[PDB]
Subunit: 81 residues, 3 copies
């Protein structure tokens, strides 16, 4: 086994290398991990979009209120001294 | 013996394979990175929840204002006959 | 035999992951984390935007509440 590699020497060498079995096993764990986190990230993006629309709606309502207050103040001043 | 692998050819061939050490290091950094992301994603989830509560709270305030404005307008209608 | 043939070696290494396969996956994982960071940063910005808008509107709402107080007083004067 001095010039060429023997089966015992190869097996011994291969003890320190990664098998396809181990590699693929880990790949599935990683892919499923990204899947669950990304699903959470997407769900939160959805909640944000929902908040954004309501925030604009509220800003619209507020603007209306500010106008109404101006009208109320004009009517009050109209009856004032 | 020309059909056999020499020690040098084995070493060269193994240059293109992964050691358990390299793989374990990668696994750890990856799983550990997912942990960090979990912290980040959950933190934003909590920030979103707080935005939701505040938006709902302010929405209620807006409705109270809307109710107030109508009562005012009626008191003004009565004053203006 | 007891010596490894070129073919036997090839056959055996087929059950081990190649450096190229591994490197490809590693790059894919790291770039995927990069994308998550991209989206997390973007959503963080949207969150900050909403936080800023809410604080602002919160201020205005309180002012409005006060304004209604002064309006009710003016009305009471005109009626009560």
């Amino acid at each position: 086994g001095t010039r060429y590699v023997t089966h015992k020497q190869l097996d011994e060498k291969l003890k320190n290398f990664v098998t396809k079995t181990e590699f693929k096993e880990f790949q599935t764990v990683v892919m499923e991990s990204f899947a669950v986190q990304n699903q959470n990230i997407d769900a939160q993006g959805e909640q944000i979009k929902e908040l954004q629309v309501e925030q604009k709606a509220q800003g619209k309502t507020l603007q209306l209120i500010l106008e109404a207050l101006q009208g109320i103040n004009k009517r009050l001043d109209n009856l004032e001294s």
